[PDB]
Amino acid sequence: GAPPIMGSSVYITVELAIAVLAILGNVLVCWAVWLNSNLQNVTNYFVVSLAAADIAVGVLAIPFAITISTGFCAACHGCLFIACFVLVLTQSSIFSLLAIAIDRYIAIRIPLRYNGLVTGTRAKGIIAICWVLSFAIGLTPMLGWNNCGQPKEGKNHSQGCGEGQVACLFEDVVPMNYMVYFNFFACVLVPLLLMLGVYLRIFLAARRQLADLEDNWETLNDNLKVIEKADNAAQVKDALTKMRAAALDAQKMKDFRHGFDILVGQIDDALKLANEGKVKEAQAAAEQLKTTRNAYIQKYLERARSTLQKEVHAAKSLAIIVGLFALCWLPLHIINCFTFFCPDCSHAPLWLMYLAIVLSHTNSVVNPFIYAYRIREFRQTFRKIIRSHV
Numbered sequence: 001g002a003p004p005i006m007g008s009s010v011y012i013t014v015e016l017a018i019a020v021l022a023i024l025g026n027v028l029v030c031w032a033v034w035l036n037s038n039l040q041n042v043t044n045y046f047v048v049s050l051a052a053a054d055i056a057v058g059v060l061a062i063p064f065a066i067t068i069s070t071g072f073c074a075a076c077h078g079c080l081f082i083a084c085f086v087l088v089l090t091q092s093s094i095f096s097l098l099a100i101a102i103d104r105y106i107a108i109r110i111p112l113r114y115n116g117l118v119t120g121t122r123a124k125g126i127i128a129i130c131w132v133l134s135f136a137i138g139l140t141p142m143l144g145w146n147n148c149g150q151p152k153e154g155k156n157h158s159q160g161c162g163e164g165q166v167a168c169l170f171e172d173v174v175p176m177n178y179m180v181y182f183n184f185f186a187c188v189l190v191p192l193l194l195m196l197g198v199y200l201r202i203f204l205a206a207r208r209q210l211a212d213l214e215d216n217w218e219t220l221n222d223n224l225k226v227i228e229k230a231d232n233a234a235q236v237k238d239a240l241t242k243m244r245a246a247a248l249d250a251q252k253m254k255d256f257r258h259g260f261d262i263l264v265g266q267i268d269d270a271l272k273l274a275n276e277g278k279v280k281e282a283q284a285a286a287e288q289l290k291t292t293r294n295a296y297i298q299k300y301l302e303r304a305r306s307t308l309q310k311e312v313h314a315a316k317s318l319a320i321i322v323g324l325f326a327l328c329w330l331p332l333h334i335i336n337c338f339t340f341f342c343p344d345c346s347h348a349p350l351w352l353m354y355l356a357i358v359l360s361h362t363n364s365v366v367n368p369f370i371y372a373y374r375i376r377e378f379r380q381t382f383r384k385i386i387r388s389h390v
């Protein structure tokens with residue numbers, strides 16, 4: 001078998017290339033938010049926390065991955081920290097992603113209460129607590145859920161380790177039942193299934209609210225034709241009461257409230273001539289609603305449609321970032337399951353283990369590109385930053 005150093009050199013060179021890109025791209029995300037007040041909403045504070053975690057992957061997690069790949073002699077508990085510190089950063093990324101899903105769900109479901117409920121100070125508090133839980137969760141093995149009490153005395157005497165030390169290797173010190181049940185199933189897979197369900201409810205809601213609009217818009221228009229072609233005062237009365245209720249459930253910013261007070265006011269005039277029995281004077285009064293609909297109502301339809309379509313396109317960009325996290329991290333998780341559940345399977349080869357590790361660390365590079373390709377405000381700020389400074 002070849003000198004371990006040769007394949008070892010490839011792995012290191014690759015891991016360092018990844019760390020450079022992780023730092024640069026996510027530093028540029030942070031610079032952008034710092035610089036552009038349009039980017040300084042509550043959602044993007046979570047985006048920033050996510051970015052700071054991806055920077056820390058290049059600054060610390062990747063240097064740790066290189067170290068533990070050597071099996072150098074180390075005191076067990078210090079070896080656990082080198083091995084698990086990435087689990088803290090990964091857990092903080094999940095919390096951050098989960099908070100974004102909820103933040104956007106609160107914006108689609110209750111737009112009118114969003115600003116008083118999701119504030120910057122509350123977000124700061126959430127981010128501060130999620131980082132505290134991430135250290136707790138990601139370093140649980142250090143509290144005694146570890147194989148430190150079972151040292152591999154073959155490996156440790158070969159390496160020449162001393163009194164208290166172990167050959168520092170991930171699968172030798174981190175119990176695989178912590179990795180599968182606690183880290184994967186509970187702390188990664190369940191949160192990602194939640195985010196899946198949140199983003200589903202976001203899209204149903206926007207799809208619901210949209211059809212409610214288009215369905216309110218035809219209620220307004222259809223009932224016009226009823227009036228136009230009626231012959232007794234009563235058909236008009238029945239047709240008008242439907243628009244009125246439709247015009248207020250749509251109503252459910254002083255130009256918008258003047259437009260609908262022109263509209264309902266007209267409806268309430270045609271409803272009075274109808275109730276009085278004047279049939280033609282009610283059809284002609286109800287024809288004055290065309291002027292209001294062309295001047296005011298169509299314009300709330302098109303504007304209410306844009307904001308909903310813009311929320312959908314925005315939640316789709318954020319759903320992609322949750323997909324890439326999963327795409328990138330599931331291989332390393334799925335191999336742990338095989339190692340743990342299939343004792344009669346051969347262990348996955350070394351080359352695949354470090355290919356799945358390298359894959360997991362590339363997730364720290366992709367988010368900056370997603371923002372740039374999918375978010376105008378981020379792309380335009382990236383260009384200003386680059387164009388000017390470099």
Ligand SMILES: CC(C)CCC[C@@H](C)[C@H]1CC[C@H]2[C@@H]3CC=C4C[C@@H](O)CC[C@]4(C)[C@H]3CC[C@]12C
Nearest residue numbers: 059060073074075076077078079080081082165
């Ligand atoms: C503030 C940031 C940037 C720097 C953090 C310092 C890091 C690199 C320090 C903090 C604790 C340190 C570890 C603590 C204990 C041990 C056990 C010893 O037998 C080998 C070294 C080892 C494994 C250390 C490696 C370096 C280490 C991980």
Ligand SMILES: CC(C)CCC[C@@H](C)[C@H]1CC[C@H]2[C@@H]3CC=C4C[C@@H](O)CC[C@]4(C)[C@H]3CC[C@]12C
Nearest residue numbers: 326327328330331332334335338345346347348
């Ligand atoms: C993107 C995510 C969701 C999909 C990743 C699935 C990958 C990691 C799967 C697909 C096929 C799998 C392999 C299939 C069979 C074996 C042989 C066994 O003796 C060791 C594990 C090993 C080598 C598996 C490891 C995990 C594996 C490589």
Ligand SMILES: CC(C)CCC[C@@H](C)[C@H]1CC[C@H]2[C@@H]3CC=C4C[C@@H](O)CC[C@]4(C)[C@H]3CC[C@]12C
Nearest residue numbers: 189326330333334335337338339341342343345
């Ligand atoms: C699709 C993703 C997002 C969720 C499901 C991922 C995990 C939990 C699933 C996907 C495929 C599964 C593996 C498929 C095959 C086997 C071989 C068997 O002898 C032991 C269990 C084991 C190793 C399974 C463990 C759980 C597993 C790794």
Ligand SMILES: Nc1nc(NCCc2ccc(O)cc2)nc2nc(-c3ccco3)nn12
Nearest residue numbers: 086087169170171179332333336350353357
């Ligand atoms: N199973 C595993 N191994 C390693 N590194 C050890 C690679 C190895 C594997 C086998 C061997 O004989 C010698 C070394 N890092 C690992 N990281 C993870 C992981 C991190 C987050 C989720 O899973 N799993 N994981």
Ligand SMILES: CCCCCCCCC/C=C/CCCCCC(=O)OC[C@@H](O)CO
Nearest residue numbers: 059060061063064067068072073074075082
């Ligand atoms: C945040 C600002 C920038 C921080 C930059 C430095 C961060 C630390 C990066 C490196 C960490 C790797 C730790 C290596 C430990 C190696 C070690 O113990 O070597 C000696 C070993 O032989 C003990 O037997």
Ligand SMILES: CCCCCCCCC/C=C/CCCCCC(=O)OC[C@@H](O)CO
Nearest residue numbers: 327328331332346347348349352355356359
């Ligand atoms: C779209 C999903 C694709 C997965 C994500 C990217 C790649 C992740 C890492 C691994 C993927 C598949 C690896 C297949 C080959 C594994 C292999 O060589 O098995 C060796 C086997 O003989 C061990 O006994």
Ligand SMILES: CCCCCCCCC/C=C/CCCCCC(=O)OC[C@H](O)CO
Nearest residue numbers: 007008010011014350351354355358359362
């Ligand atoms: C998923 C988003 C877009 C990025 C795609 C993933 C790219 C990551 C794949 C990287 C491949 C190079 C792998 C590392 C080189 C070292 C290696 O494979 O094995 C090193 C060993 O010691 C060999 O036994």
Ligand SMILES: CCCCCCCCC/C=C\CCCCCC(=O)OC[C@@H](O)CO
Nearest residue numbers: 026027028030031032033034035055056059
């Ligand atoms: C190893 C540590 C990782 C690197 C640090 C990553 C943080 C990225 C910093 C980018 C933006 C947030 C900090 C704002 C700094 C403001 C500054 O430098 O000048 C002040 C001026 O721009 C204010 O008008």
Ligand SMILES: CCCCCCCCC/C=C\CCCCCC(=O)OC[C@@H](O)CO
Nearest residue numbers: 045046048049050052053056060124127131
């Ligand atoms: C022993 C290794 C070093 C230990 C100390 C490293 C501390 C953890 C490293 C990673 C991330 C630090 C957390 C920073 C979060 C900053 C953040 O996003 O704040 C700004 C955000 O709230 C927007 O307003």
Ligand SMILES: CCCCCCCCC/C=C\CCCCCC(=O)OC[C@@H](O)CO
Nearest residue numbers: 023058059060062063066067068070072073
């Ligand atoms: C700009 C952010 C700062 C990045 C971190 C600066 C310091 C670390 C630089 C990069 C990689 C560390 C590589 C060495 C890790 C392993 C090591 O030193 O020894 C392991 C083993 O051979 C000991 O016997």
Ligand SMILES: CCCCCCCCC/C=C\CCCCCC(=O)OC[C@@H](O)CO
Nearest residue numbers: 184185186188189190193337340341342343
């Ligand atoms: C998806 C939400 C539920 C929790 C997270 C995912 C876990 C369930 C999905 C698939 C598989 C995990 C359950 C164990 C399957 C393997 C098993 O039976 O082990 C075989 C046994 O003979 C080994 O001792």
Ligand SMILES: CCCCCCCCC/C=C\CCCCCC(=O)OC[C@@H](O)CO
Nearest residue numbers: 323326327328330334338342344345346347
């Ligand atoms: C969006 C990402 C999610 C995509 C789906 C992820 C889950 C896919 C799981 C991948 C493979 C499971 C099937 C492989 C079975 C291997 C097997 O039976 O090996 C036989 C054993 O004797 C090897 O020695």
Ligand code: NA
Nearest residue numbers: 054093363364
């Ligand atoms: Na991450």
